[PDB]
Enzyme design. Sequence first.
Site, PDB file in Angstrom:
ATOM      1  N   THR C   1       0.775  -1.345  -0.015  1.00 26.77           N
ATOM      2  CA  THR C   1      -0.068  -0.030  -0.040  1.00 26.77           C
ATOM      3  C   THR C   1       0.796   1.395  -0.074  1.00 26.77           C
ATOM      4  O   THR C   1       1.746   1.174   0.600  1.00 26.77           O
ATOM      5  CB  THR C   1      -1.101   0.134   1.238  1.00 26.77           C
ATOM      6  OG1 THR C   1      -1.819  -0.822   1.190  1.00 26.77           O
ATOM      7  CG2 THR C   1      -1.753   1.149   1.234  1.00 26.77           C
TER       8      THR C   1
HETATM    9  C1  6VC Z   1      -1.635  -2.142   2.039  1.00 30.95           C
HETATM   10  O1  6VC Z   1      -1.532  -1.542   3.246  1.00 30.95           O
HETATM   11  C2  6VC Z   1      -2.926  -2.846   2.130  1.00 30.95           C
HETATM   12  C3  6VC Z   1      -4.048  -1.884   2.516  1.00 30.95           C
HETATM   13  C4  6VC Z   1      -5.359  -2.886   2.855  1.00 30.95           C
HETATM   14  C5  6VC Z   1      -6.526  -1.901   3.635  1.00 30.95           C
HETATM   15  C6  6VC Z   1      -6.171  -3.195   1.571  1.00 30.95           C
HETATM   16  N1  6VC Z   1      -2.896  -3.862   2.945  1.00 30.95           N
HETATM   17  C7  6VC Z   1      -3.075  -5.191   2.636  1.00 30.95           C
HETATM   18  O2  6VC Z   1      -3.156  -5.961   1.590  1.00 30.95           O
HETATM   19  C8  6VC Z   1      -2.922  -6.231   3.720  1.00 30.95           C
HETATM   20  C9  6VC Z   1      -1.509  -6.764   4.414  1.00 30.95           C
HETATM   21  O3  6VC Z   1      -0.512  -5.605   4.552  1.00 30.95           O
HETATM   22  N2  6VC Z   1      -3.390  -7.514   3.477  1.00 30.95           N
HETATM   23  C10 6VC Z   1      -4.426  -8.051   4.047  1.00 30.95           C
HETATM   24  O4  6VC Z   1      -5.058  -7.422   5.161  1.00 30.95           O
HETATM   25  C11 6VC Z   1      -5.079  -9.342   3.668  1.00 30.95           C
HETATM   26  C12 6VC Z   1      -6.363  -9.264   3.269  1.00 30.95           C
HETATM   27  C13 6VC Z   1      -6.703 -10.724   2.922  1.00 30.95           C
HETATM   28  C14 6VC Z   1      -6.431 -12.106   3.358  1.00 30.95           C
HETATM   29  C15 6VC Z   1      -6.140 -13.492   2.884  1.00 30.95           C
HETATM   30  C16 6VC Z   1      -5.885 -13.349   1.404  1.00 30.95           C
HETATM   31  C17 6VC Z   1      -5.462 -14.287   3.573  1.00 30.95           C
HETATM   32  C18 6VC Z   1      -0.222  -2.869   1.668  1.00 30.95           C
HETATM   33  C19 6VC Z   1       1.105  -2.010   1.361  1.00 30.95           C
HETATM   34  O5  6VC Z   1       0.036  -3.759   2.580  1.00 30.95           O
HETATM   35  C20 6VC Z   1      -0.710  -3.836   0.413  1.00 30.95           C
HETATM   36  O6  6VC Z   1       0.319  -4.788   0.205  1.00 30.95           O
HETATM   37 CL    CL Z   2       1.110  -0.873   4.760  1.00 30.69          CL
END
Ligand code: 6VC
Ligand code: CL
EC number: 3.4.25.1
Lengths: 201, 203, 202, 213, 220, 196, 196, 216, 204
Positions: C1
């Site tokens: 993100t």
């Molecule tokens: C973002 O911080 C992004 C923001 C979120 C509000 C969409 N975060 C994520 O994608 C996070 C991991 O950091 N992922 C999750 O919460 C997992 C969701 C689904 C879980 C199953 C697939 C197991 C970034 C920079 O982290 C995105 O990379």
């Molecule tokens: Cl993040």
Amino acid sequence: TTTLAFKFRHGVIVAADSRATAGAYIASQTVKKVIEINPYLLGTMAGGAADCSFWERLLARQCRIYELRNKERISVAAASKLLANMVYQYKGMGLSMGTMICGWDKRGPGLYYVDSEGNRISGATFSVGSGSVYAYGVMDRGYSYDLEVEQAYDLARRAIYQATYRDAYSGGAVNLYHVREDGWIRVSSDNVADLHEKYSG
Amino acid sequence: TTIMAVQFDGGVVLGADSRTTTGSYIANRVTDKLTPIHDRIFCCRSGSAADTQAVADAVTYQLGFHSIELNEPPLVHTAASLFKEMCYRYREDLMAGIIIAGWDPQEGGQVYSVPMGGMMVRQSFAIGGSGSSYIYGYVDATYREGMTKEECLQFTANALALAMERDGSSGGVIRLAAIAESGVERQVLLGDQIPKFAVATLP
Amino acid sequence: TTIMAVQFDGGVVLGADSRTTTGSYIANRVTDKLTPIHDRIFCCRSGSAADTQAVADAVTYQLGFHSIELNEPPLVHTAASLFKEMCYRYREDLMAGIIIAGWDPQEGGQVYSVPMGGMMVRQSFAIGGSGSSYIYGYVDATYREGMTKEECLQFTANALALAMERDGSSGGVIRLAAIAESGVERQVLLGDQIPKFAVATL
Amino acid sequence: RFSPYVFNGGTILAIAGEDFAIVASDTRLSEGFSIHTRDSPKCYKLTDKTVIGCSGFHGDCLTLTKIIEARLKMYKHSNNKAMTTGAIAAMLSTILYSRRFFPYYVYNIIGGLDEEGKGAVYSFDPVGSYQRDSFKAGGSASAMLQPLLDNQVGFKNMQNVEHVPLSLDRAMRLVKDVFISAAERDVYTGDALRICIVTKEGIREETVSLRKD
Amino acid sequence: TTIAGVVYKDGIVLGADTRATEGMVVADKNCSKIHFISPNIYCCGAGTAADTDMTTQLISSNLELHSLSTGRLPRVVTANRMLKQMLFRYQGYIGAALVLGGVDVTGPHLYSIYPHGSTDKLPYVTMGSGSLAAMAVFEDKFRPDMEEEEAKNLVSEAIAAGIFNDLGSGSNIDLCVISKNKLDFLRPYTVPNKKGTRLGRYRCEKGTTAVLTEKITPLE
Amino acid sequence: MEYLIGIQGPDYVLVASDRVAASNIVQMKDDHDKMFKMSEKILLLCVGEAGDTVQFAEYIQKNVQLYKMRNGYELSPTAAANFTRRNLADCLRSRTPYHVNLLLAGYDEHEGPALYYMDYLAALAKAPFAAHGYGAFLTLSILDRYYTPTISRERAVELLRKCLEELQKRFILNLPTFSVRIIDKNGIHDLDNISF
Amino acid sequence: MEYLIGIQGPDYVLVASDRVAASNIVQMKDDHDKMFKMSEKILLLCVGEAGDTVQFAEYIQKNVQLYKMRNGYELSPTAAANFTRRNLADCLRSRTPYHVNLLLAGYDEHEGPALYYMDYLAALAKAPFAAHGYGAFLTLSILDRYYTPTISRERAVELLRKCLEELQKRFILNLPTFSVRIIDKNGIHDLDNISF
Amino acid sequence: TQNPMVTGTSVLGVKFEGGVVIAADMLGSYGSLARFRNISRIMRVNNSTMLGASGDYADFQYLKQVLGQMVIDEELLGDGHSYSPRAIHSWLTRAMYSRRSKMNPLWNTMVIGGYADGESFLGYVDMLGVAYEAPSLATGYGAYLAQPLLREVLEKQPVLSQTEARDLVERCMRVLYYRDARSYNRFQIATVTEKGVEIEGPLSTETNWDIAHMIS
Amino acid sequence: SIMSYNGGAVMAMKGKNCVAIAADRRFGIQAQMVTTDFQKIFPMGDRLYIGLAGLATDVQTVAQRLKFRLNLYELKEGRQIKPYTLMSMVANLLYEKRFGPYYTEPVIAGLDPKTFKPFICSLDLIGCPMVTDDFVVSGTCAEQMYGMCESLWEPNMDPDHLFETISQAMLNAVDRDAVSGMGVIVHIIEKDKITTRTLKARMD
Ligand SMILES: *[C@@](O)([C@H](CC(C)C)NC(=O)[C@H](CO)NC(=O)CCCCC(C)C)[C@@](C)(O)CO
Ligand SMILES: [Cl-]
Ligand SMILES: *[C@@](O)([C@H](CC(C)C)NC(=O)[C@H](CO)NC(=O)CCCCC(C)C)[C@@](C)(O)CO
Ligand SMILES: *[C@@](O)([C@H](CC(C)C)NC(=O)[C@H](CO)NC(=O)CCCCC(C)C)[C@@](C)(O)CO
Ligand SMILES: *[C@@](O)([C@H](CC(C)C)NC(=O)[C@H](CO)NC(=O)CCCCC(C)C)[C@@](C)(O)CO
Ligand SMILES: [Cl-]
Ligand SMILES: [Cl-]
Ligand SMILES: [Cl-]
Ligand SMILES: [Cl-]
Ligand SMILES: [Cl-]
Ligand SMILES: [Cl-]
Ligand SMILES: [Cl-]
Ligand SMILES: [Cl-]
Ligand SMILES: [Cl-]
Ligand SMILES: [Cl-]
Ligand SMILES: [Cl-]
Ligand SMILES: [Cl-]
Ligand SMILES: [Cl-]
Ligand SMILES: [Cl-]
Ligand SMILES: [Cl-]
Ligand SMILES: [Cl-]
Ligand SMILES: [Cl-]
Ligand SMILES: [Cl-]
Ligand SMILES: [K+]
Ligand SMILES: [K+]
Ligand SMILES: [K+]
Ligand SMILES: [Mg+2]
Ligand SMILES: [Mg+2]
Ligand SMILES: [Mg+2]
Ligand SMILES: [Mg+2]
Ligand SMILES: [Mg+2]
Ligand SMILES: [Mg+2]
Ligand SMILES: [Mg+2]
């Protein structure tokens, strides 16, 4: 595994079950746990199967070399000592072995317990393996130096049998040997299911 | 630490901050992280001070002997290869992120990265050290093919100033070097000479 | 993100990448990380998707009720305060790095950061999420006091594109929103519309 | 923690007849929840009279089989004759034990003819414990195969049944049946069944399709 | 498990395989993974089997209470909210990974719902140990506004990709097709895997098994 | 678990040891001997880890005997104790440490009777009486209570018997029989086993 | 460490238990009793963790006695065994689990003698004979060897004595005396202690 | 290597009539950071053989150095014998196994492609010495995302033309760029035929982001 | 593993208008046999049985607590419980302990009390149900049991053939498991009678 042996007036009785396990899986019901070191010397196997087989086969090699070099049979004491000295170097590396070395030499009937922890001890009777506690109870209540031959066979067979009953890790067949002054003989192989039918409270 | 080097037509510019840390104590505020390996070949050092000093001293020795034997100035690519061989072979025992840059008569101005792990790659410009994270964007938006020496010096000084503002682990003065056929020109930007960009206080 | 918001005279611009990851698998390549909290108040979400969705839903509820009770549009500062209260109180159980931005009639365009841990600070512009590391330098060198709306949109799109190039954890499309007294204007930059800066080949 | 092992699946089986031996295996090579290939047999020809089945960690299966092959040529050069099935088995026991403290992660079953021309099966644990068997399953689905063989080949738990000799044709039917049953339940067993039949005339090969899921 | 869903021109197609595992052993060859939520809403489940069953049953039940009260057909958003709020409350300890699809007064809607309580509203989704195989099919071949039969082909292709490439997935392909006008619960849709036939007969005659004791108890 | 005891009087040293070899919950031998004859007037009593105990004691024994064959006369008790200590201490930080606890009893023509105590770390102490094993915890105070330096050999055997009876009464382990020996100007004498 | 044994014949149940209370390396009591009278024809034998054992047994005892006072007649052995089991199992996953192993022996007017075995997990088994403790490993096979269902009470005491002699010979712990009781139509009888 | 540092993601390979094609993006990642965006992860070994590597890039460079020197040594002899693709694959298996058995692996997964004597060769070797051959291969996330597509095409049509194999590889590279957060949209394609080994690049896939407006 | 502390095996099997359920008879604690007549199969109706393998204490608790619930159900409702309804009752009981489960995995075998249609199912320890048309297995030798059932079971077996098949599947499976066996009990359930047999079996 349950193995036992004892000295008495007419030599040494040696007996074992025939089960092998890998965790709780029964890998075999037909393992030979009494190894023929030479015609007047037997070894028994309990613990890790590879470990017992390898080290007792190596013992057999060494005893034979000894015979060729010295022009006489190795004693039970010396054979048990060779085995003890071999495994001592590996203590703490995870070998798992408990063996009885059973023969008849110039001091008469011979019996030594030898293991991977470093123990080496002579004695009248021994039992080794996960079922040994059960075999000891029955062997101890029936043992006498002055047992008749057939009574000695009966006792050995019954002690192993009772061990196979209580101990999940022992079973199959009871294999019995008798070390006499002119050599060991194979006495019997009796499936535990056939002994169940026969015995005997 | 933040380190950087940039190729131009006829040479290279190298730059570093001057901070040595243990945890968050500054053990040296005016460290010289640009070390000469031969007449026209420098390395920029990041990671362990002990490790990068030991490795730089060993390479200097190897390269010096090699050069006397051949009776010629060494290739920049040879210096980089020697760093790489040592950083790769001892990768489990070293913490060293290096840039090798310099000039030789055969290939001109050249920049090589030897990051932790001991890979080697030639680049137009390179950045390294922990502070470099904060300037990837800046260098990617600002780099232009064909920059002059004077433009590479400004580009480098600007990038390092930005990293030093944001990274607690970088700071002090900016040390710069330009290397070309004519020799090595070193300088220090300090205090008011360091490029300056406002904190965006509230309208 | 990567998330970002910028103040201008009369409003705000917000932006985000569109990538949701588990480890290095992309579970959603077109995520919408800019969520409306009221008519002219948005939040940009980073950290746990579960946590930031739960918290944004709860604040939307609280702010909505508050707004009906008062019979007035809510303050941007109020929205930020509600986020902060929840993010601070539950800081040991949440992974949430939030930007709250919007417009109200009393204070105009405002940007607030609520980073992990639940502090709150007003800023001219804010960046967050893991990709933000790679654009601190860029934003510090490029920010100018007094940018127009159109300049804030370009500044945001550029910053986000650079982060998205370098951060494995960011990517996909750029979502932008501009908020002012007249309303909310959303758009998506995709493919060839994303600002482009060469790989520096030899 | 780099681990030097991974589990790659594989089910092996051998049956001794009066004048034949069968060695059979599935052809799936797996890792984690993935299939590397659907055409990776676990049987290897050692001599005209002897076949070995190997399953477990594929890196070790490859290494060990190449070691055995080199040792068989060394033996033939020093002794002027091919290794017997029994000697191959005894030698393998020592090769496995030589790694007692960093084992070959391999379950081995040898099938061949003994010196009287009779079927011989030898089975091994990873550190070289072994014995001669009448029939034996190994690898991923061994606990599924073994009981049915105990019952149908060993006649165990059956009353009033003639203990007749095992024909090749019946042994073959049993082999295909047990792998088909295993393919239903063991996630690692599948794709195809490869069967080698060792007789005095040589080694011939049958393949039969299994479920691909 | 491989589960998946797609939004097509007039509705939703959901898909699932029929394998359940315990460790690396198949426990069920014909598990039903596409669960009733309401007459217009269904939900595929992956993860811990008891948790997917119980979670979908509970929400279905609460939704029936909701619709009985409102007198209206339920909305997909409402199922989504109810599921995600419960899963969030349990902090990922309820191991239900869901593909929720239906058709309501506002048209077709498809959501993926994760154990920790995040949801994503998307035109195609996959979950389970086969989900990347199934997603490759979708990325390569999905188009917006497919016709019913195209969408059905695509979903079964995607489930098949998981069946054949994931050791966790197998047996049959089930589909559920939901439009304004129709609900087609197609169990099985395809049976691409079949047990091989038995070559020998083991029909053991009476007396083969020796018996120690016997008691017949007659009943009414 | 293994018990050793020694009592030195004016012109003799009396020693005893249990005769049990145990493994897990069972006694596997009830006539075990824990004493090693080093020379005509020296006994080494050894307990500790399996393998280590016999390997160590027999190595010392063979070397003490070798000394006699090379030189025509025996090591003194004190010299043998120090030899034993050098070996144990030299192995302590090696790849092959020996986890053994020892008593060395002897009689020297010129120095009289001696009793030495050694632990597995190879600290060596001369003592008028000593004991090893958990049983020592219950018997040392009995020795402190009743021992005197002029104690006759008769009364030493009685004092020994008080110690062994205390193990029967109070100790949690089944140690029913003990080897007993005495060393004096005429060498090593076997006394009757003390049994319960 | 604690040994319990029971042997059920045609019209009686014989039970015995060691009389040692130990702590670390010492026996602290040699006349300890591990049997609890629940009613005229019920004994509960209880071993395990200190505190848990007495707390659990006395709670069961008081409640069995309460049942008698409330109702005018006693719980049967089987009802008492199931009551005991319900309590242990209900505590297993609570904040207050009881780490105890038990035998319940009794005689019912209509059902005859009964012996029940229970472990700390609260699995309940009816058995013709049974034992708890490390000593069980050495004695259960002796019972399997010589027990018959019509065994007379004399022979049961002989069989018992074979078991107890085996512990003296072969077991590493010093358990020199045992409480012995029998239950039949006429209630609970104390027999002579068996001692060594 | 105990701990990989700069790393490459998936490598793909597929056999076709007259040759083999392999593909790999040009990225060296440092954790999540897309750090070195113009590195080749493919090697021409000799005229009949090529190699692509996933995993630790410094370990790949070492292999390249060792294997490059081995082909040079062999060419010096000028004796009419050359290492076949299969021989190179064998050597690689031994080298990885040997390094695994010293508890000091080379942290790579490799795809070897070749063409010799009218036969296409495609082989896999991993850091533990797991090796095999197949009509198509994919390392890393490619094993989950690309290999299902490769195998499904190959079941309907086991024999592909060069242009069919190339189009199939491009589709797989696209999926990887959509779904692998360590991928990068700049890749190379290497082909081996009768004529030798050709490496093409830098290449990019077109992408489609229509779904961004279907939050549905 | 908690589930192997006591060992044990149960299975059920469907025939034409009959069902069969079988269990081993050992009660043991790790290696040690304690008893050889331990009950694992419990009547829940005239034609409806539940078999439980796993931790012996939970085998007993689940049987007992299930019987409490069933008795109340039958008194309150007019009637005998249907097989499918018993399954659900058991699922609900197990899932109530989702976060501190009973360590038992039951099988159910019975005939519908009105229609006499055969039913078999099994459940995992947190109450996930699985109905089948052939067989179900649960216990420490499940792989052994699957291998025998897959190879021997055929559709539409009469009571005598059903008995031989389930008996051979049990005996040969437990003979490859150290901690299951010491005897086998088999119930055959038909419309008009229950037949209970103990089998000649290995006692090692
Ligand atoms: C973002 O911080 C992004 C923001 C979120 C509000 C969409 N975060 C994520 O994608 C996070 C991991 O950091 N992922 C999750 O919460 C997992 C969701 C689904 C879980 C199953 C697939 C197991 C970034 C920079 O982290 C995105 O990379
Ligand atoms: Cl993040
Ligand atoms: C025995 O001690 C038995 C003795 C052995 C000489 C057969 N030991 C084993 O079965 C061991 C126990 O772990 N198992 C093995 O070494 C691995 C598998 C053996 C391979 C067969 C082909 C022999 C008992 C008591 O452990 C037997 O249960
Ligand atoms: C730099 O990487 C910097 C470069 C170094 C070549 C001067 N590294 C250090 O300052 C390192 C990082 O820990 N510090 C040391 O090696 C400690 C020297 C120890 C002397 C006493 C303080 C123990 C940056 C970015 O890390 C500088 O912060
Ligand atoms: C599926 O996710 C599958 C979905 C499930 C709803 C059937 N999950 C399972 O099979 C899980 C995976 O651990 N197994 C269980 O919850 C144990 C209960 C299974 C036994 C029956 C009584 C249901 C996949 C991809 O995991 C299947 O492999
Ligand atoms: Cl045998
Ligand atoms: Cl010799
Ligand atoms: Cl001895
Ligand atoms: Cl054993
Ligand atoms: Cl007898
Ligand atoms: Cl500084
Ligand atoms: Cl420095
Ligand atoms: Cl670096
Ligand atoms: Cl660096
Ligand atoms: Cl650094
Ligand atoms: Cl989100
Ligand atoms: Cl933050
Ligand atoms: Cl943030
Ligand atoms: Cl994305
Ligand atoms: Cl929602
Ligand atoms: Cl690059
Ligand atoms: Cl190249
Ligand atoms: Cl209840
Ligand atoms: K700084
Ligand atoms: K990116
Ligand atoms: K399968
Ligand atoms: Mg260092
Ligand atoms: Mg599959
Ligand atoms: Mg959370
Ligand atoms: Mg040692
Ligand atoms: Mg407590
Ligand atoms: Mg069994
Ligand atoms: Mg047994």
